[PDB]
Amino acid sequence: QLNHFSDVANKAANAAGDVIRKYFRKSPVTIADQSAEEAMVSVILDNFPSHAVYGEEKGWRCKQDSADYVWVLDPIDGTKSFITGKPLFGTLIALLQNGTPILGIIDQPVLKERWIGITGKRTTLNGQEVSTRTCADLSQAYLYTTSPHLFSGDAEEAFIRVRDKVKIPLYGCDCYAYALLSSGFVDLVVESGLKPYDFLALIPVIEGSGGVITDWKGHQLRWEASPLSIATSFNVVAAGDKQIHQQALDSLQW
List binding-site positions for Mg(2+): 56, 74, 76-77, 198
Q: Which stretch binds a second copy (CB under 8 A): 63-71, 172-180, 191-199, 221-229?
A: 172-180
Instruction: Please give the residue whose beta carbon sits closest to Cl ion in the complex.
Output: 148
The sign of the dihedral angle between the CA atoms of 111, 77, 104, 1 is negative
Q: If we measure between CA atoms, which residue out of 89, 123, 76 comes closest to residue 103?
A: 123
Q: How far apart are CA 80 and CA 68, in angstroms?
A: 34
Radius of gyration of the chain (CA): 17
The pairing of strands 168-171 and 142-145 is parallel
Q: Give, as ranges, the residues between 148 and 187 that touch Cl ion (CB under 5 A).
A: 148, 150, 152, 155
Q: Does 216 bind Cl ion (CB under 5 A)?
A: yes
Length of the chain: 254
CA dist 144 and 114 (Å) reads: 20
User: Does 192 interact with Cl ion (rule: CB under 5 A)?
Assistant: yes
User: What mask of x and - would describe binding to a second copy in positions 76 to 115, judged by CB under 8 A?
Assistant: ----x--xxxxxx----------------------x----
Residue closer to a second copy by CB (options 28, 59) is 28
Nearest Cα residue to 221 out of 247, 243, 245, 187: 245
Picked from a second copy, Cl ion, none, the partner binding residue 192 (CB below 5 to 8 A depending on kind) is Cl ion
Binding mask 212-251 for a second copy (x = CB under 8 A): ----------------------------------------
**What's the DSSP call for residue 220?**
P
Write out the residues near a second copy by the rule CB under 8 A: 25, 80, 83-88, 111, 142, 168, 170-171, 173, 176, 180, 183, 185-186
